[PDB]
């Protein structure tokens, strides 16, 4: 069943951008409704934590600027495993989140901390969102092949030979 | 395809020229007369 990749994906929530509008507040919370957000990432059982205890280089900037990212943090570090985290963010327009994975090594004869290692690629656009290279230059090349070979064989069509003069048009 | 068909044709124009060099290259009574003149000066000369 033809499925068109999540690279190449683009979700739209006119709603969401009328009711809320773009900013880096509620940029995790626009991104919650997507299709990339899963379910099973540690980011939705620390949603639902705080639900139940309601109801009962430019790293480090973004670091220091806001106070909801410290939370993040301090609600992230006990859970390990699959986590959204935020990369860079510039006003008024362009957000993108760092898509890693955290496996918290303790074990002894370790002294880094939790391990930190990169998944995926997502861009905030506008109201758009986008998620390799290898494929863009290889799709590329292969199309212009395509069109290279057509106009060899129009050309060759083209070509006439005679034997006491050669090749000629 | 091109290598192919250009070598065959290159043969071909090589038969062709060693044809054209085989063609090119290889280098390799009076009596009776006068009596004939005799007739012919005479009736000439009659019919003149």
Redesign the interface.
Known sequence: MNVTPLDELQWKSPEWIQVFGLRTENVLDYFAESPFFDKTSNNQVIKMQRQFSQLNPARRQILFKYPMYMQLEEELMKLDGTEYVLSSVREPDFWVIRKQRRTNNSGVGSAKGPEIIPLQDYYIIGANIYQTIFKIVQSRLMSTSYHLNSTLESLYDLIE?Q?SQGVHY | TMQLIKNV?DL??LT?SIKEKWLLNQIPDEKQIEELLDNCIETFVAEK
Request: net charge positive; hydrophobic share 50%.
């Open positions: 030979f034997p | 044709q071909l124009i062709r």
